[PDB]
Amino acid sequence: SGGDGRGHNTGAHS
Amino acid sequence: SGGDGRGHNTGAH
Amino acid sequence: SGGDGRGHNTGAH
Amino acid sequence: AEIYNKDGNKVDLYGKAVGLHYFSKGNGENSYGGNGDMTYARLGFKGETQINSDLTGYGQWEYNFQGNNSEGADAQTGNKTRLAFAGLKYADVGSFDYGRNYGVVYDALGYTDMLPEFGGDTAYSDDFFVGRVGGVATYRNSNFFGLVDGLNFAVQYLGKNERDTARRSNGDGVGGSISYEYEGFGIVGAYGAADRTNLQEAQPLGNGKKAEQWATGLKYDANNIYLAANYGETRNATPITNKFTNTSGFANKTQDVLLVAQYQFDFGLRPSIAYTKSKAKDVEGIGDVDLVNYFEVGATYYFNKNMSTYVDYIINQIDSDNKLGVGSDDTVAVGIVYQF
Amino acid sequence: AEIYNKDGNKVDLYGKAVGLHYFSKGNGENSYGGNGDMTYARLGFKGETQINSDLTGYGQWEYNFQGNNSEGADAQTGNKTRLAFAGLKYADVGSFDYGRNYGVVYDALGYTDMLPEFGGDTAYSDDFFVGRVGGVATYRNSNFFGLVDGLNFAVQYLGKNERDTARRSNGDGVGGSISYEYEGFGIVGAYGAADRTNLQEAQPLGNGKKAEQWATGLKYDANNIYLAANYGETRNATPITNKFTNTSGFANKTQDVLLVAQYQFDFGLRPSIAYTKSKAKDVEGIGDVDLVNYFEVGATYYFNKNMSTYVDYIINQIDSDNKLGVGSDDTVAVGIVYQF
Amino acid sequence: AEIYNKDGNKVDLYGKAVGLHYFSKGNGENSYGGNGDMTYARLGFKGETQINSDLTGYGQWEYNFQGNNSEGADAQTGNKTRLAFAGLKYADVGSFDYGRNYGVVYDALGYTDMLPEFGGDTAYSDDFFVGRVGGVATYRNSNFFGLVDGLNFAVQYLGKNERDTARRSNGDGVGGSISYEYEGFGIVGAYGAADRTNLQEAQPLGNGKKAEQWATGLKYDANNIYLAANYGETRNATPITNKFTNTSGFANKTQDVLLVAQYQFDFGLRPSIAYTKSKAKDVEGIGDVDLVNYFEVGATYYFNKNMSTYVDYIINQIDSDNKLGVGSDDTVAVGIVYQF
Numbered sequence A: 001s002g003g004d005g006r007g008h009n010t011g012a013h014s
Numbered sequence B, C: 001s002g003g004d005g006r007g008h009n010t011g012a013h
Numbered sequence D, E, F: 001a002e003i004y005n006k007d008g009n010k011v012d013l014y015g016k017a018v019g020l021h022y023f024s025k026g027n028g029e030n031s032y033g034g035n036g037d038m039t040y041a042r043l044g045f046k047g048e049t050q051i052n053s054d055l056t057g058y059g060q061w062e063y064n065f066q067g068n069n070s071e072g073a074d075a076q077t078g079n080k081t082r083l084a085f086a087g088l089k090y091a092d093v094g095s096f097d098y099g100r101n102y103g104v105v106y107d108a109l110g111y112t113d114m115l116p117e118f119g120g121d122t123a124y125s126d127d128f129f130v131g132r133v134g135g136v137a138t139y140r141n142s143n144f145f146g147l148v149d150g151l152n153f154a155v156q157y158l159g160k161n162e163r164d165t166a167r168r169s170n171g172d173g174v175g176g177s178i179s180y181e182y183e184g185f186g187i188v189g190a191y192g193a194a195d196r197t198n199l200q201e202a203q204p205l206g207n208g209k210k211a212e213q214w215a216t217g218l219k220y221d222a223n224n225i226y227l228a229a230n231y232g233e234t235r236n237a238t239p240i241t242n243k244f245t246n247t248s249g250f251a252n253k254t255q256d257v258l259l260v261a262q263y264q265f266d267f268g269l270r271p272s273i274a275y276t277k278s279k280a281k282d283v284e285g286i287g288d289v290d291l292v293n294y295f296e297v298g299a300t301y302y303f304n305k306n307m308s309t310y311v312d313y314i315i316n317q318i319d320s321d322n323k324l325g326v327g328s329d330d331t332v333a334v335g336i337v338y339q340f
């Protein structure tokens, strides 16, 4: 379960 | 199972 | 299980 | 969403992600829909190819992934393939498709299957011709070879499927449907009969060697209004469950009534009201009972063709002392839907 | 269908919906293919990226959803993942890919796996190097570094897989294949050996610590004609089930012969004739037995690259008094296919 | 990969095929990761629609197909739906989404979940707010309504899911997170509490009527350097299994520490070093125990945006006499990845 934290962020990308 | 009856149609594609 | 053997050959085409 | 279109072959890859929650009092075991998370997602593709000036081929597949399951041993709970068929079409001669598809009697029931979440309680899946079933060869013709505008009919042959369960099994049968539409008004009738498997007869509820289903529908669809009414009767075909003795089977006879009223505002909000009552008769050991019975107050806000939100309240009229243990509590569904 | 192609990375999203029905007398329990609905659908993607002028990366995935299952508790019966691998490629030096992919012996067996529905009975799934298997590292080279036109070879390493079933298990092993093609003619040879798991050894049928599979093929493909012949021998590799004693395992030795003849009409119709006979030796308690034995008469009409329809009749020669209970009845498959 | 964008609706259909193999001594039952084939594949879609100048709707779905299973009765082992949610967004007011998504406490833990294969051992699936969970309503705000650059916060409501297992169950709860980023530096804190199900309380390990999880993170991401540190403490939330008496439940208290150092070379090579130690206290019958404890040495070579290969070595520090039976052997992951 590795590498999933790469781009997690608060809010919605756009 | 709601909203599925829209469209469908008795004939054609 | 028919028709799957076509092509293949050897290597990534 | 159409993702490919070259050399007269277009492929529509469509899906949706529905964040959904049901609200019922208590644990919800005695309710109409239940209580808790109900999020789900749908994926599928619709393909169409122009073989020549008249001939046209098409195929379709649709799958339902559930989102309310854990990544543990129950990850696959509720996942299934809804449709999977292929067919051909000739200009005005008609269209033939085979595979897992809708039964012909749904042509009628669809008139009243317009609610945001619930509705169409009679269109049972894997129940002869009233819902999605497996291995149905269906020939359909539109506009009667181009001679009458609005006149359509269909004929369908359902092959036998001896499955491990009595609920999901069926024998050989035939069915058909007729429909006419003029200036937003529509009338429809559909009928279907089929044999019953040995396992189906061995069940305590239901008796007979033939299953029978027929329904009729009337709708008006225009000027932002949609009104629809359905009446149907089933013999040895509707599934029933007695929760007190832990026995299952089919009702020897059922009378079904469906009503729908809906308006569409210019800015999106769509109010919806509906009524549904299905009542079985000649049930061994109970006699007459109500299987479905409720009023609906619901609204759907269409942000656009791709995004929507809805709220569906089911005022359940089923008696708290129902002789089969059918749920009697209310249920409120709240959903937010993205789709493409 | 190619749905994306930007920055030297193209992605082909492909699928198909096959409405299929098998016809055999009775329930079909004593038949070659069975009886009833067999509709199914396939989805997958093939990706290819140009890393630089010479280096190329690629990956593939394919899944099989069944359409002959109900939406109830048996919805997932028969669903599976067929392929799943990734690899790299250098100009003529070769290609290395790992994952679930085809065994090297399929290179030979593929010559005769051209029938519309049946055929290729020797390419068993999860059976060492003859069919789709899991965790195989494969190095493949074409034209021997670009020096000889038509000369290709392959070497494959099969990893250990101790699964819950004796049928679906395998040990460590190695295999290879060589092929030469000249002016429509093609000759191929392939061999593979591997260890056997304790679970595989503990089974009543079969004896030994190593399993061995090899096959050789000869083909002519040109002028709308396709002829192909395969001869192969297996040791402790072909799965067997004795239906009278309800026991499973592998044949200590098998002789497998495949023959295929096909013609292609300009307007689409493709007649096909084939012969297939697999016979086991050293079977505990029985001696020599017939595993597969039939003639095939079939036709496939290509409406175009996206749609097809075929009929496949298998005239089964298996003896009705076969000492392993192998089916002896005929089977006729009828299929209508949309694909993209 | 963006495959559709018309009328203000774009759809990203993304996937990847990961050829993966684990290497550990023996069968790997006493190891950290295991041994054998670990190939897998992912499919999903990301949709975003511009409802108007300010409002934006979006939805997402992600699935995990396994490739290390046979086509037989074990075909579905390990397959699952990772994500499935839908939501809306208003300009600077925030974004609200519901469905199966990540818990808020993951906002912090992601800082150290950067390793090629392993890592993030605290981000358990279906474990309150540290990982992917079902039916979570999440409100998130970026830059605090546009007033502070780099300041983000989130609040989340977790609905109850009473499943058949205590591991995959949860009660009602609420949680939140705060994060600040300035010139590549980042500080984060997150906390969450929730009730526990009757089934969860009845388990032998663990005590209490409420479960709580919190973590804090610090990272530096710039100039091709990535440093990250995580500290978190959990009470009645971490799942544990005592293999000697075969009992399961949750640790009454755990102290979790994560450290990650990574560099990014211009030509692709990314060296990685990491430390991870999760330590439990107040475990019934043992007291203090080590759940996770290792150093990590790994490298990932990015050929380009679509293809990659990595090698991950886990130097396991767990004691061979672990009082809960935690694996003590090392494990080496080797992977080749195609993705789009």
Ligand SMILES: CCCCCCCCO[C@@H]1O[C@H](CO)[C@@H](O)[C@H](O)[C@H]1O
Pocket: D019, D020, D021, D035, D036, D037, D334, D335, D336, F098, F137, F157, F158, F159, F160, F172
């Ligand atoms: C459109 C989707 C709205 C998301 C609903 C968020 C509220 C979560 O719903 C919660 O479910 C629990 C049991 O299921 C109940 O006990 C709680 O009262 C309720 O708040």
Ligand SMILES: CCCCCCCCO[C@@H]1O[C@H](CO)[C@@H](O)[C@H](O)[C@H]1O
Pocket: D098, D137, D157, D158, D159, D160, D172, E019, E020, E021, E023, E035, E036, E037, E334, E335, E336
């Ligand atoms: C190309 C696919 C054609 C669809 C075939 C429709 C006819 C259904 O086939 C049916 O199968 C049943 C046993 O399985 C039997 O009742 C009969 O053989 C037949 O009526």
Ligand SMILES: CCCCCCCCO[C@@H]1O[C@H](CO)[C@@H](O)[C@H](O)[C@H]1O
Pocket: E098, E137, E157, E158, E159, E160, E161, E172, F019, F020, F021, F035, F036, F037, F334, F335, F336
């Ligand atoms: C990135 C993927 C690399 C492919 C690894 C090829 C080497 C296969 O790995 C083999 O697997 C067996 C267990 O199944 C072990 O017993 C062998 O020691 C090992 O060599």
